[PDB]
Design a protein around this ligand. Structure first.
Ligand SMILES: *[C@@H]1O[C@H](CO)[C@@H](O[C@@H]2O[C@H](CO)[C@@H](O[C@@H]3O[C@H](CO[C@H]4O[C@H](CO)[C@@H](O)[C@H](O)[C@@H]4O)[C@@H](O)[C@H](O[C@H]4O[C@H](CO)[C@@H](O)[C@H](O)[C@@H]4O[C@H]4O[C@H](CO)[C@@H](O)[C@H](O)[C@@H]4O)[C@@H]3O)[C@H](O)[C@H]2NC(C)=O)[C@H](O)[C@H]1NC(C)=O
Ligand SMILES: *[C@@H]1O[C@H](CO)[C@@H](O[C@@H]2O[C@H](CO)[C@@H](O[C@@H]3O[C@H](CO[C@H]4O[C@H](CO)[C@@H](O)[C@H](O)[C@@H]4O)[C@@H](O)[C@H](O[C@H]4O[C@H](CO)[C@@H](O)[C@H](O)[C@@H]4O)[C@@H]3O)[C@H](O)[C@H]2NC(C)=O)[C@H](O)[C@H]1NC(C)=O
Ligand SMILES: *[C@@H]1O[C@H](CO)[C@@H](O[C@@H]2O[C@H](CO)[C@@H](O[C@@H]3O[C@H](CO)[C@@H](O)[C@H](O[C@H]4O[C@H](CO)[C@@H](O)[C@H](O)[C@@H]4O)[C@@H]3O)[C@H](O)[C@H]2NC(C)=O)[C@H](O)[C@H]1NC(C)=O
Ligand SMILES: *[C@@H]1O[C@H](CO)[C@@H](O[C@@H]2O[C@H](CO)[C@@H](O[C@@H]3O[C@H](CO)[C@@H](O)[C@H](O)[C@@H]3O)[C@H](O)[C@H]2NC(C)=O)[C@H](O)[C@H]1NC(C)=O
Ligand SMILES: *[C@@H]1O[C@H](CO)[C@@H](O[C@@H]2O[C@H](CO)[C@@H](O[C@@H]3O[C@H](CO)[C@@H](O)[C@H](O)[C@@H]3O)[C@H](O)[C@H]2NC(C)=O)[C@H](O)[C@H]1NC(C)=O
Ligand SMILES: *[C@@H]1O[C@H](CO)[C@@H](O[C@@H]2O[C@H](CO)[C@@H](O[C@@H]3O[C@H](CO)[C@@H](O)[C@H](O)[C@@H]3O)[C@H](O)[C@H]2NC(C)=O)[C@H](O)[C@H]1NC(C)=O
Ligand SMILES: *[C@@H]1O[C@H](CO)[C@@H](O[C@@H]2O[C@H](CO)[C@@H](O)[C@H](O)[C@H]2NC(C)=O)[C@H](O)[C@H]1NC(C)=O
Ligand SMILES: *[C@@H]1O[C@H](CO)[C@@H](O[C@@H]2O[C@H](CO)[C@@H](O)[C@H](O)[C@H]2NC(C)=O)[C@H](O)[C@H]1NC(C)=O
Ligand SMILES: *[C@@H]1O[C@H](CO)[C@@H](O[C@@H]2O[C@H](CO)[C@@H](O)[C@H](O)[C@H]2NC(C)=O)[C@H](O)[C@H]1NC(C)=O
Ligand SMILES: *[C@@H]1O[C@H](CO)[C@@H](O[C@@H]2O[C@H](CO)[C@@H](O)[C@H](O)[C@H]2NC(C)=O)[C@H](O)[C@H]1NC(C)=O
Ligand SMILES: *[C@@H]1O[C@H](CO)[C@@H](O[C@@H]2O[C@H](CO)[C@@H](O)[C@H](O)[C@H]2NC(C)=O)[C@H](O)[C@H]1NC(C)=O
Ligand SMILES: *[C@@H]1O[C@H](CO)[C@@H](O[C@@H]2O[C@H](CO)[C@@H](O)[C@H](O)[C@H]2NC(C)=O)[C@H](O)[C@H]1NC(C)=O
Ligand SMILES: *[C@@H]1O[C@H](CO)[C@@H](O[C@@H]2O[C@H](CO)[C@@H](O)[C@H](O)[C@H]2NC(C)=O)[C@H](O)[C@H]1NC(C)=O
Ligand SMILES: *[C@@H]1O[C@H](CO)[C@@H](O[C@@H]2O[C@H](CO)[C@@H](O)[C@H](O)[C@H]2NC(C)=O)[C@H](O)[C@H]1NC(C)=O
Ligand SMILES: *[C@@H]1O[C@H](CO)[C@@H](O)[C@H](O)[C@H]1NC(C)=O
Ligand SMILES: *[C@@H]1O[C@H](CO)[C@@H](O)[C@H](O)[C@H]1NC(C)=O
Ligand SMILES: *[C@@H]1O[C@H](CO)[C@@H](O)[C@H](O)[C@H]1NC(C)=O
Ligand SMILES: *[C@@H]1O[C@H](CO)[C@@H](O)[C@H](O)[C@H]1NC(C)=O
Ligand SMILES: *[C@@H]1O[C@H](CO)[C@@H](O)[C@H](O)[C@H]1NC(C)=O
Ligand SMILES: *[C@@H]1O[C@H](CO)[C@@H](O)[C@H](O)[C@H]1NC(C)=O
Ligand SMILES: *[C@@H]1O[C@H](CO)[C@@H](O)[C@H](O)[C@H]1NC(C)=O
Lengths: 129, 453, 129, 129, 48
């Protein structure tokens, strides 16, 4: 089905993992001398800033695929102490971010490191052949 | 069994935030303009088929009284009011000493001359010869100063500019929209007092047509409530906090200006030209507003039945009129056909309800020189040009702005009087069911998946 | 050769498939209080909106390579009923878009589905190892 | 360590090749009627133009990985005549760009050609299977 | 060094009388005529 934009906002993370191509679709874009022109323009640039803020992180991380992705960073237990079948079938994305909001910035540091490290490491395999 | 982080892009993750919203109005609003629309000049045409997604299992907490789309709307309306009168003709070479008299009428001594037939000089196209021309003004616009010699009421407060006659003051539906990365959540609960969790929430891109109607005591052409009439208040116990009432059934109101006015086209300068009020064609009659006493009967009964849910069940509820102050607060200040009415609401809020075919007409006064919203700086004052013909308008009464008295431990009853002054309430009566949220679609989750090397 | 920007606009789709790196090059970018500043600015932002409109679709589809690409969506005959050597050697891109303008939006739906479906499917292969 | 933004600006190219994920991080993003609003806005759009100018080149080249990359273009000796262990351990990035500023545009032409050529060539391998 | 690329085999249909770059040009010229005389000396105390 197509529940639409943000359809699975109250659904389990496993059920909302099906609707990631819909929320990404409507995330960018669906006049004389006045005050509404700027009213729309500064919003129309904030849209772009809010999009590329995410995209540059998605790029400097290992995954420019822009949908879903796995990474070579061990899930540090200290972050949640919850179970695979107890979050993907018993918790909502908002609730989840509510738990992990504290450590989000930390994780971003580790992803940037792991990715730069992987790319530097792969150049050495490409250079010997 | 060793877990791995996994990045997710497009997760239903939002957070409460505040952005610059823009307008949106139908294609017809852009159609009906001889430069007549006061806003639609650069508004985005609305989506032909708006879409409202119901978010199942979602429970979001709203707060109407600390919502920011209201502040944006009001300050934007203020700025639009401002900007629409900048290039319009300024009446600085007015305020001349006015030699005024009563209007031509023989009525009893219990009729104070509301209208004054005034004569004064004026500068013609050339900056030499003056101009002994006459006009007709309302008593509220003028004030004596020491043959009765007057002045305009605002000559001693601020400058003045006339509102161009080409522009109109017709409230049109405005849909407010948010930019990409944001969304507007709309509570879909029938009984919701604006504060707390909403069981049935949906989302949308642009709200429904919210007409910016400027009134003070009674909300007009608003959105009706569903089923039982709605009461909303930030703190019911605090007698200083207004109580916004939203109606379930509309109360029909009819306001009319029974004076076939005349427009005098004076030439004050080589470009500017002033629109005075010429002689009246017909009878000297007063503006008035009608309210069917039956519908008002049942409406007052239905609001008191909802009041008893908050102030104890076996108590007496009395209604009294305003206390006093400015005319803008003590009268139902509003605009209809262009003239700015100020009606006496003493015949609507003089009642008393115990635990258990005609129209109520209201004396409505008219004022042309109004200075709401401070005047865009400390200077500008607007003259509402005179309107030819009898103006008749039919509106809906869709809500009230009440205030309770501070009896403390006075009685089992407490009296309620109309209030207002702060017009942000006029918008909180329609932006009680909406809130803004930013989208942060980056979410990481664990799973036993690692990308290979 | 380098026929330049839009050189092969009247050429067959097979001959214009050689000049895709040129039209993509010149597709992004080759002052006091005035009215020309905004005149250029609103155009300079429309450039970016018109670019990223295409890029987000190219991303949510299987191919962020940004040049040419194949997809796992069967060409539904009902769309054209024309032949491989009768379009790539006997038809111009404009003419072609003139035929397929009706179904373009439909195809985009199918591409978004196929891609989200492929990525979800590949995570399951990556998780078992 | 994290020497910070532009930490290795006076360091050898080999030592600065470790800090490429830091300079890329701070390369995008770390109000009434006035003149500062536009003062910030035209700068806030120049940021985006200066970013995507680089990104479109990085895309039309073979490498959208956005970190480091190798290419199938032979290093034409006529450009430098210097040694691998005499630039990566004895020269700074600025000095290096100071040498190669003359030929930079030439190299960009060759990269665009090689990439369009590779992609056209890979479609023929994908079409036979 | 302006560059003009000749598009071979191309046949496009023009219509000068319903072309919009004209409307933009004229209304822009009007607005420029306007804006150039705003801060200039006004002869209101003339017409004597
Ligand atoms: C709550 O909701 C109610 C219900 O909608 C609303 O009532 C509205 O009242 C206004 C004010 O009277 C009405 O607007 C006027 O309508 C008259 C005549 O009605 C129609 O007549 C023809 C067909 O018979 C229609 O084509 C026409 O559009 C009207 O709808 C008009 O005479 C008025 O138009 C004049 O003023 C407009 C702006 O003020 C101009 O745009 C228009 O061109 C007209 O200008 C002429 O006016 C001068 C004399 O007045 C004349 O000298 C000039 O030369 C110029 O030619 C105006 O449209 C409106 O119809 C009512 N509602 C609806 C849905 O029609 C309440 O107003 C609202 N609450 C509040 C607070 O407003
Ligand atoms: C608000 O106050 C203003 C003050 O100026 C009033 O304006 C004047 O009102 C008077 C009457 O109230 C008007 O006078 C009338 O003028 C008519 C025109 O005749 C003159 O004009 C022609 C050229 O058009 C000349 O050639 C000629 O010689 C005249 O000089 C007269 O016909 C009228 O006569 C009638 O009334 C008088 C009143 O005394 C009688 O004696 C006559 O027999 C006859 O019945 C009259 O004199 C005057 O014109 C108005 N001013 C202007 C500029 O027109 C407003 O009327 C007043 N408004 C209200 C609502 O009270
Ligand atoms: C011009 O203005 C004058 C006012 O200056 C106005 O004259 C007034 O007319 C009324 C008539 O309605 C007079 O009022 C009367 O007063 C006496 C007592 O003094 C009453 O007894 C009369 O009673 C009648 O009305 C009652 C209710 O209305 C009825 O119940 C009763 O049966 C009678 O019918 C009556 O009210 C008033 O005194 C005069 N004013 C003066 C100063 O004389 C005149 O009508 C106006 N003319 C025009 C053409 O405008
Ligand atoms: C994110 O990290 C912060 C710390 O940086 C966590 O805040 C801490 O939360 C606990 C509750 O889980 C707080 O304890 C509180 O103590 C007061 C004192 O009486 C008590 O009244 C409360 O009922 C509660 O028990 C603790 O004070 C607080 N830390 C600080 C410094 O205030 C937060 O919980 C973390 N977020 C999540 C989702 O875990
Ligand atoms: C004064 O209030 C009355 C309220 O009854 C207004 O007439 C009513 O207007 C509402 C919309 O404002 C109509 O409701 C709409 O009806 C459509 C019909 O398809 C429905 O699909 C919508 O969801 C919406 O509910 C209502 O039908 C209409 N009543 C009648 C009897 O026609 C009137 O317009 C108001 N006057 C003003 C504001 O000037
Ligand atoms: C895209 O789809 C539309 C339909 O949604 C196609 O429009 C249809 O085109 C045919 C011609 O191929 C029209 O037939 C016409 O009938 C009139 C009636 O006499 C005749 O005078 C014409 O000569 C022609 O034969 C048909 O009416 C039209 N459909 C509608 C609803 O108007 C369109 O052709 C498709 N585009 C392409 C490139 O195929
Ligand atoms: C403005 O109107 C007044 C009357 O409303 C005129 O007042 C006259 O002023 C002169 C001053 O020298 C006196 O001599 C007259 O007695 C006044 N009354 C008159 C002339 O009726 C004044 O002249 C008018 N201004 C003009 C015409 O420029
Ligand atoms: C401006 O004018 C208004 C009205 O003419 C003045 O308000 C009145 O002021 C007088 C004397 O100060 C009082 O007797 C009245 O009671 C006031 N009216 C009301 C409704 O309060 C105001 O003071 C003037 N402002 C000045 C001269 O600065
Ligand atoms: C809207 O109605 C609800 C329900 O009556 C109100 O919730 C009350 O909140 C206060 C403190 O916030 C609690 O002490 C009460 O116990 C709550 N009521 C119930 C029945 O649990 C809420 O305050 C109301 N909000 C407004 C603005 O009227
Ligand atoms: C209000 O007064 C105006 C005065 O112009 C009336 O307009 C004139 O009305 C008469 C008869 O009704 C017509 O013969 C004239 O042609 C009208 N004047 C113009 C310029 O057209 C108007 O009719 C009056 N109001 C009403 C309701 O009749
Ligand atoms: C308010 O005005 C409306 C329209 O002017 C009134 O509705 C009509 O009124 C006329 C005359 O009174 C009747 O002949 C019609 O039958 C009425 N139609 C409808 C649909 O009501 C309305 O009654 C007025 N109400 C008040 C309180 O003034
Ligand atoms: C509300 O009603 C009361 C009582 O009818 C009005 O009070 C009268 O107001 C007038 C005007 O100031 C005074 O002359 C009377 O003396 C007042 N009566 C009493 C008993 O105080 C009051 O005016 C009404 N409110 C409004 C805004 O009109
Ligand atoms: C609003 O209505 C009240 C109530 O009718 C008015 O108060 C009246 O004032 C007049 C004086 O002009 C007295 O003769 C009446 O007796 C008063 N009514 C009552 C019931 O006492 C009031 O004047 C009206 N207007 C305003 C602005 O308050
Ligand atoms: C509320 O309104 C009613 C309706 O007018 C007022 O009743 C009037 O009371 C006076 C007493 O002085 C009588 O002389 C009138 O005949 C009554 N009018 C009617 C129509 O019955 C009542 O006075 C108002 N409330 C208050 C507190 O005065
Ligand atoms: C991760 O968990 C380990 C447990 O060995 C703990 O020592 C470490 O501090 C945690 N790391 C961070 C960065 O929180
Ligand atoms: C106006 O009318 C009232 C009452 O009719 C009267 O008392 C007053 O003196 C009149 N004033 C003038 C200037 O005619
Ligand atoms: C609301 O009213 C109560 C009544 O006693 C008061 O104590 C309180 O301070 C007010 N404000 C609130 C509840 O925020
Ligand atoms: C109408 O309102 C009046 C005002 O108090 C009240 O006396 C009367 O009972 C009401 N009508 C009905 C039917 O309740
Ligand atoms: C008042 O009594 C009615 C029944 O007459 C009841 O339905 C309602 O809940 C009561 N309201 C209170 C006690 O606030
Ligand atoms: C594709 O062609 C098939 C033929 O089997 C037809 O049934 C189907 O409707 C077509 N699909 C669409 C979406 O047009
Ligand atoms: C690259 O070096 C070769 C040496 O064989 C030289 O002939 C050629 O001109 C150089 N190419 C360019 C484009 O400078």
């Amino acid at each position: 089905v197509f529940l639409g934009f943000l359809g699975a906002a109250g659904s389990t993370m496993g059920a909302a993992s099906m609707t990631l191509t819909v929320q990404a679709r409507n995330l960018l874009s669906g006049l004389k001398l006045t005050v509404w022109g700027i009213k729309q323009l500064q919003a129309r640039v904030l849209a772009v800033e809010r999009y590329l803020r995410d995209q540059q992180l998605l790029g400097i991380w290992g995954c420019s695929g822009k949908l879903i992705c796995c990474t070579n960073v061990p899930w540090n237990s200290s972050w949640s102490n919850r179970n695979l079948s107890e979050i993907w079938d018993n918790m909502t994305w908002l609730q989840w971010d509510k738990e992990i909001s504290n450590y989000t910035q930390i994780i971003y540091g580790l992803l940037e490191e792991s990715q730069n490290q992987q790319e530097k490491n792969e150049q050495d395999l490409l250079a010997l052949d | 069994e060793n877990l791995w982080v996994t990045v997710y892009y497009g997760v239903p993750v939002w957070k409460d935030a505040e952005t610059t919203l823009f307008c949106a109005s139908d294609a017809k609003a852009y159609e009906t303009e001889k430069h007549n629309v006061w806003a639609t000049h650069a508004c985005v045409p609305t989506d032909p088929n708006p879409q409202e997604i119901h978010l199942e299992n979602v429970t979001e907490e709203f707060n109407m009284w600390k919502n920011n789309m209201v502040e944006q709307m009001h300050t934007d309306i203020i700025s639009l009011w401002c900007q629409s009168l900048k290039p319009c003709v300024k009446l600085t070479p007015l305020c001349v000493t006015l030699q005024c008299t009563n209007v031509t009428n023989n009525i009893t001594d219990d009729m104070r001359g509301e209208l004054k037939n005034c004569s004064f000089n004026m500068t013609t196209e050339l900056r030499d010869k003056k101009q002994k021309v006459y006009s007709l003004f309302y008593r509220l616009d003028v004030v004596q100063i020491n043959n009765k010699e007057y002045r305009l009421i605002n000559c001693n407060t601020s400058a003045i500019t006339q509102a161009c006659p080409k522009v109109s003051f017709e409230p049109i539906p405005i849909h407010y929209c948010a930019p990409a990365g944001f969304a507007i959540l709309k509570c879909k609960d029938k009984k919701f007092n604006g504060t707390g969790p909403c069981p049935s929430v949906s989302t949308v891109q642009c709200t429904h047509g919210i007409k910016p109607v400027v009134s003070t005591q009674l909300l007009l052409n608003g959105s009706l409530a569903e089923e039982e009439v709605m009461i909303r208040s930030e703190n019911i116990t605090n007698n200083a906090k207004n109580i916004l009432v939203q109606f379930n059934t509309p109360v029909q109101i009819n306001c009319t200006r029974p004076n076939n006015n005349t427009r005098k086209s004076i030439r004050i300068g080589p470009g500017q030209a002033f629109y005075a009020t010429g002689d009246i064609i017909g009878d000297i009659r007063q503006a008035h507003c009608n309210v069917s006493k039956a519908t008002w009967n049942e409406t007052l009964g239905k609001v008191v039945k909802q009041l008893r849910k908050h102030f104890g069940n076996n108590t007496i509820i009395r209604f009294a009129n305003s206390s006093g102050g400015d005319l803008e607060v003590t009268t139902h200040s509003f605009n209809c056909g262009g003239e700015f009415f100020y009606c006496n609401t003493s015949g609507l809020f003089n009642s008393t309800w115990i635990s258990n075919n005609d129209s109520i007409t209201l004396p409505c006064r008219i004022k042309q020189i109004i200075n709401m919203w401070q005047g865009c700086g400390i200077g500008q004052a607007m003259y509402a040009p005179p309107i030819q013909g009898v103006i008749r308008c039919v509106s809906n009464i869709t809500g009230l702005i009440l205030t309770r008295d501070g009896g403390s431990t006075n009685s089992t009853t407490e009296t309620f009087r109309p209030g207002g002054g702060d017009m942000r309430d006029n918008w909180r009566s329609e932006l009680y069911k909406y809130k803004v949220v930013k989208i942060e679609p980056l979410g990481v989750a664990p799973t036993r998946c690692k990308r290979r090397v």
